[PDB]
Amino acid sequence: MNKKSKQQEKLYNFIIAKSFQQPVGSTFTYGELRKKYNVVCSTNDQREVGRRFAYWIKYTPGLPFKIVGTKNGSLLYQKIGINPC
């Protein structure tokens, strides 16, 4: 919608790109990707992006990711292969 937080858009755009850059087979959590973000942001902005990410990945079809378990109380994702055959 029209109104939005510039700060969360930036962190989210980064998390998305960083997830796609994961090599095939690698496992990761949101917090592992978040800690590689160079800019400081509030805990509030971290958790909002975390949840927008957790639902993007779980309900957007055709993404090269799946859930494989948990790690340190967070969901554990895995980058999977994109190009069968």
Name, in order, each residue with C-beta under 8 angstroms of 18's C-beta and a sequence gap of 6 or more. Answer: 33, 36
Experimental method: X-ray
Identify the burial level of 63 via C-beta atoms within 10 angstroms of its C-beta, where 0-12 means exposed, 13-18 middle and 19 or more buried. Answer: middle
The count of residues in the chain is 85
Q: How far apart are the first and last CA of the chain?
A: 40
Resolution (A): 2.2
Show me where the domains of the chain are located.
Answer: 2-85
Asked if residues 56 and 17 have their Cβ atoms less than 8 Å apart, the reply is no
Identify the burial level of 50 via C-beta atoms within 10 angstroms of its C-beta, where 0-12 means exposed, 13-18 middle and 19 or more buried. Answer: buried
